[PDB]
A paper describes a structure:
Reduction of the alkyl chain length from n = 10 to 9 gave compound 10, which is the most potent L. donovani NMT inhibitor reported to date (LdNMT IC50 = 24 nM). It also showed somewhat lower activity against HsNMT1 (IC50 = 60 nM) and PvNMT (680 nM). High-resolution ternary structures of compound 10 were achieved in both PvNMT and LmNMT, with the latter structure revealing the first structural evidence supporting the proposed catalytic cycle of NMT. 10 sits in the peptide-binding pocket, and mimics the key recognition elements involved in binding the parent peptide (GLYASKL). The N-terminal amine electrostatically interacts with the carboxylate of Leu410 whilst the hydroxyl group of the serine hydrogen bonds to the His213 side chain. In addition, there are ionic interactions between the amino group of the lysine and three neighboring aspartic acid residues (Asp98, Asp100, Asp385), all of which are conserved in equivalent residues CaNMT. The aliphatic chain on the N-terminus and the N-terminal amino group of the inhibitor are guided by the peptide binding channel to the C-terminal residue of PvNMT–Leu410. Unusually, the inhibitors in this study showed a higher specificity for P. vivax NMT in comparison to P. falciparum NMT. An alignment of the primary sequences of both enzymes (see ESI†) highlighted four differing residues within 6 Å of the peptide binding pocket: Ile102, Tyr212, Ser228, Tyr334 (PvNMT) and Val102, Phe212, Cys228 and Phe334 (PfNMT). Of these differences, the replacement of Y334 to F334 in PfNMT constitutes a structural change in the peptide pocket that could lead to a loss of potential hydrogen bond interactions within the catalytic site.
Residue numbers in the entry: 27 to 410
Write the structure that this text describes.
Amino acid sequence: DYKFWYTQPVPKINDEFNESVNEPFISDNKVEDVRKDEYKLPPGYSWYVCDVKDEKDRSEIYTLLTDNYVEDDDNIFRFNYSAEFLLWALTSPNYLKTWHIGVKYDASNKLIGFISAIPTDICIHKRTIKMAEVNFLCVHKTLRSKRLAPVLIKEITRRINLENIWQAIYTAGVYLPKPVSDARYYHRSINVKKLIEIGFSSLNSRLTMSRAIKLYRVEDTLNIKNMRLMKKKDVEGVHKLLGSYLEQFNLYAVFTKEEIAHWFLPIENVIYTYVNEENGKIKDMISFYSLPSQILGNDKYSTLNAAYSFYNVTTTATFKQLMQDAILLAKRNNFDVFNALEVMQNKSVFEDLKFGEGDGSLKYYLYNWKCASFAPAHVGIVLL
Ligand SMILES: CCCCCCCCCCCCCC(=O)CSCCNC(=O)CCNC(=O)[C@H](O)C(C)(C)COP(=O)(O)OP(=O)(O)OC[C@H]1O[C@@H](n2cnc3c(N)ncnc32)[C@H](O)[C@@H]1OP(=O)(O)O
Ligand SMILES: NCCCCCCCCCC(=O)N[C@@H](CO)C(=O)N[C@@H](CCCCN)C(=O)NCCC1CCCCC1
Ligand SMILES: [Cl-]
Ligand SMILES: [Mg+2]
């Protein structure tokens, strides 16, 4: 059952809506009526507002997620967002410090839970709505299944509603009421022997080690020869190319110029964006973010270096050629695997480019919004 989720303005498990339905579960909400008081925590635990711009607070969030964040279904790989990744993820334009909420255990003064949101304009089925994007919900492994997570959820909802914002977008690997879409992850091996060693991949009695290395070999030469790291001059051209491209989709972020600068200007070991400029015009782009996983219980390796497909647009090449070059640039940047969801145009190139189907899928959710669900080809946004 979903005893907490049932109490929320989200679809029931059997709710099915027509294409023409595109509206809040609960309208005419009033900032005036929102609770002013912080939700109650169990005895000896306290809210804490985290300053992600302070290196020590940001270290505390980092340590909590390194120890306690999401794993694969077999508990071998744990997401290991870097501290600098977290700074970038949480400091987007017009972010609110008061949306970065920790919970401390009073007796140790240590952070045991966290939840965050950033503001984002989201276009769902051709209506743009101010939303919050919720991410990084984490409770310490030692305090699980004590119903802390609905306290964290209800508290960020209250803070977000104080800002006159009544919809949110979030993603999870767990099934919850009720996905507006569901995208499988696919994986394109780069460092094959490592991936075998750590049990990310496997060999069969058809594939020997040398065969598997040969299969995934790539030519160190770009299809689009001028693709280069994006520069601050490129920001308006990226904004034009990406903004135009994204409008075809059922669900996508509407980016200002300033969000473009934030979300794409490269930061080593965090975000990589490459552009093809022609005539002072940006005609193609490739982006991917770095998200390592800590490898649990492997004597030889501690970390799996992984690049995640972000936003990719081509006007002068094929999309296969574009994504071939995205794999190469990730190889050039020392990544072991290139990961992508079956969103946008991506699935169309998976078989050709030797991506393998994963064992997880990422569900997309909206809070307080009622709409038809859609196939993930129609999803045009990637959350972190
Ligand atoms: C308008 C503004 C709106 C703002 C708010 C919008 C919504 C934002 C929602 C958040 C979006 C975050 C997106 C995001 O960060 C990306 S998805 C990743 C979330 N993080 C992890 O998976 C970290 C590893 N696990 C944990 O820390 C814990 O297991 C957590 C904290 C997840 C659950 O802690 P726990 O100790 O295992 O459980 P209880 O405390 O006993 O709580 C049980 C209740 O929590 C429901 N639950 C479990 N996992 C959930 C999940 N991933 N989303 C939503 N709900 C989730 C569960 O169904 C149950 O409710 P139910 O009885 O109805 O079934
Ligand atoms: N919601 C925001 C973020 C948090 C939610 C994120 C939810 C996802 C959490 C992590 C997760 O399950 N990853 C999956 C996605 O497939 C994953 O890596 N599988 C890998 C490793 C499986 C390890 C064993 N079990 C996987 O299949 N390799 C197969 C690779 C292979 C390459 C060669 C060709 C065939 C397949
Ligand atoms: Cl080259
Ligand atoms: Mg709990």
